[model samples]
Target chain A: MGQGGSNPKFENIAEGLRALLARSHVERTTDEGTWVAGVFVYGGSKTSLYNLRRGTALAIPQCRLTPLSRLPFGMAPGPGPQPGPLRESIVCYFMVFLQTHIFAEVLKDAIKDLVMTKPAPTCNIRVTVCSFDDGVDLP
Target chain B: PKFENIAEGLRALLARSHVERTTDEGTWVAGVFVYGGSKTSLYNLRRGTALAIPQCRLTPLSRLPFGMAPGPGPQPGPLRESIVCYFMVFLQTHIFAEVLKDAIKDLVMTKPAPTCNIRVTVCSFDDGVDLP
Candidate 1:
């Protein structure tokens, strides 16, 4: 059960992805008796998700890479071009599930591996979840 | 190259600082400002722009495409109370100067070279009219 009857574009993507993930070395089952199908990890964390039901959810999932470097801005712009350090930078991010959360198995011979290695961070990463739909609206 | 630099730098930080946690076939968007050439050749994206990468799909399913193929023809996904993991990221670079220069955008604007300033965000949308 995938993009069986949805967007041809998303469906096409799903099909190819399915073919790849089909070879997963993991297989999981729920207490409800259903087989667990997906599992993806991200280097980022959930910030805040609002109005999840109505579709106007104010969701924010951020992945901040430790400040790359403290390169002082040379040239000259203000006070003769003063330079400051570049704040946190983002390498990348992906989406997933909420409430019905799944821990990385300390193990996972049953779930799919969309993300091979969890991106590294400097401190503790908060793993929260939220739900919304239709479109990936920008705020 | 700019993107890779940040990635490589991340690799170093991870190697030095420490561990962390985890997306999948899920849609991903990258808003990054890569530093390569000069102020004239600067690259900046304040909104979603990298949702087209085809590799994010291999990460893992994290959750079953549960209601992906819901009910009858054109029907919604399962009515079961299912949730989604929403992910988002923002890397803001403050260009603080004694005085503004060239109205923020007075450069030829080129590409991503060294440092990459990015804003990445995430969210989820399950089917079947999220019930009461």
Candidate 2:
């Protein structure tokens, strides 16, 4: 989460998502590629789980979640005040854009509900958050 | 349902801002008009009366008359840790994602005037859990 929470929270999900998609399309400086969601392309396909827009995709073995500090140029910080732990405490591979927070917020609510309503490990609800604008560290 | 050129109807004003007065006395009501959708009867929120003002619709980011500077008119409470908004085409109520709120810290080198602001992050209800 962009805030102090151990995991990203859902409070910022929409704006973060908006920021992520905007960053991918608007910024030519982004080298990681497009942030197209699986559902956007293959509606109702079995691969719907792979859609990044909705956050159904799983974290790949090689995948890593980065923080807000690493987004490329042309990306703007969102409006208002935010809390954070900041660079170097914990790291995972996900799309590193403003929208990651939005995804995290959605996931936060989804996950929070999952934890509250069901017994742990029994009904395992798997969630993976990442960005398509990843892999820009290319040579 | 398409009336040619002048077919455009007027949107009524719910309220208007009273620049000189303080408190609720100055805040004017706000209103709008709907064509493609059923016309929803005027409903009031919190305070401020709802009246049908011909030729008026709500606009975003526009300076609201009720929140006059140098006045402590109804200031929206602390930004809720939670909120929601739209992704443009979706009809579902999406929760707004919040990272930061429009608040001023006192210790800053410069003390800025507290301006009335509204910011919320939107999320899809179909997506995941709605935080409490």
Candidate 3:
């Protein structure tokens, strides 16, 4: 799905998260690999968001997937109220470098929606939250 | 569309979504329903200004905006629960996913609710192309 589709732009972004997750906080770090964003990859057919992103690929492990309600706990809050020196820093996985302010703001808002907006999210999709950066763990 | 993007959009897609359930604890069918722009829209639920569904026979439980931090300027109800609410809620107020779940929890009945047997189909969308 990263290689082709109506929304190849989005596909590349989703692939970046997959790629970023594998290497984030492992050997080295980069913004793309350590921002606080999340994406929802769906299960089953019906042209769901996952189909739009991963297609029929179901091999992604469930251990990595989490409910949307649980996504924002790890990263500290963004923008205001400096996280205390000892506090975990907020990191979104989906956003990387701010090559463009519009892109950065847009990406930031998207993560806000995924993690900050919901009742109980649907069960059919897989999710990952937290920035995976060092010192961002919750006590 | 109630929401601007995908994951929330799915919820919007399933807004009136209903279900039945049974359990070791208890049983209930889908009861409350709501639709509004962003999580903040439900704050209107605190006031009589909100329009009711009006189809049901019962009045349905109404008083619920305390969760939205509604009707006034704020103080801490639960900072632990307030972290993940609003796009820039933390930008000034600081808020959390925990806040989102809890605040929306109140809004559903007040404001949006629950129980029973259910199979959920959730779909979400957000862009990861830009960050750092």
Candidate 4:
């Protein structure tokens, strides 16, 4: 099962994410005894077990940041009279890095909650984040 | 000036580390980040300054070296797993340091500035290969 309503194999979006995160954790630690969990956010992209396994996943969603909305002139508005490509690239990189960092903090807190409830060293989770604009990736 | 003690401690930690240059770009490039074992408990010590910094302004400065050593050499599967677990712990420390640096930078830019201190410690980390 994967993102979108197309994957009938998967029950729900959250379930899919839970499965993916769990599998990733298994691959990371390679320890069956170690309990692992993670959180991921992507734009309008939907992924499946095959894509996750094959490493063909791609993030296709556009993130909306209210803070950057008011100052959107730096982004490529059109073709002519737009800011230089260098300027646009810098702005884009800054946005991606900053957004990923924020997402990581939030996910860590969520993992902490999971740990607090479990109250065991093996149950403690590690979290990571990534943004998708071009290809499947992580930050 | 307020974080002089912390800065000194950080410098001392850096001095104890061994670095290898992986990129030679005149401006910017990539490399493996690493930190050495410390005699004192860097994790338990005060790590960041206190201030309510906005999330948007944070820029994580790269201070630690990048690559991690798997261990002295290859070994049994179980031993390798243990080494990886310890390596993950080390990476978590690096992550905490970066988070702390950003947090302090945010505090320094505040209008009146805050004098409180913050400490960072790792709860846990997975050395999983699945993350991008």
For every candidate, the chain B TM-score is 0.21, 0.15, 0.18, 0.23
DockQ for all models: 0.05, 0.02, 0.02, 0.03
Angstrom error at residue B102, model 3: 11
- Deviation (Å) of A121 in candidate 1: 22
In each prediction, how many residue pairs overlap at the backbone (N, C-alpha, C within less than 3 A)?
Answer: 45, 46, 35, 11
Superposed by TM-score, candidate 2 places the C-alpha of residue B20 at a distance from the truth, in angstroms, of 30
Please tell me which model should have the higher lDDT, number 2 or number 3: 3
- Tell me, by DockQ, which candidate is best: 1
Ranking by TM-score: 4, 1, 3, 2
lDDT of 1 by residue, A1-139 (tens): 4357554332333343344435543432234322212112223223211111111111111110111111112112123221111222232222332222232231122112222222323121222232221122111
Tens-digit lDDT track of model 2 for A26-136: 222223222211111111222221223223222211112221111111112123232111111111112212223343444434433432343433123333332221211
lDDT of 3 by residue, A1-139 (tens): 3235455433444444444344323222234323222232322223333322331122221112221111122122244342221122222211021122333333333433342332223223333221211111111
How does candidate 1 score on lDDT? 0.22
lDDT for model 2, on a 0 to 1 scale? 0.20
Across B1-132, the per-residue lDDT of candidate 4 in tens digits comes to: 423454454444444444431223211111111112221222212221111111111111212211223455532221011111001111213334344344333333332312222212222222211211
> B1-132 in candidate 1: lDDT tens per residue?
533443343334333422222122222221111222222223211111112111111111111123323343652222222222112221111111100111112221222432122112222212111100
Please give the CA lDDT of all the candidate structures. 0.22, 0.20, 0.24, 0.25
Cα TM-score per model? 0.20, 0.17, 0.19, 0.22
Docking quality category of candidate 2 according to DockQ thresholds: incorrect
Q: Which portions of model 4 show Cα errors greater than 4 Å?
A: A1-12, A15-32, A35-139, B20-132
Q: Which ten residues in a row are the worst by lDDT in model 4 chain A?
A: A64-73
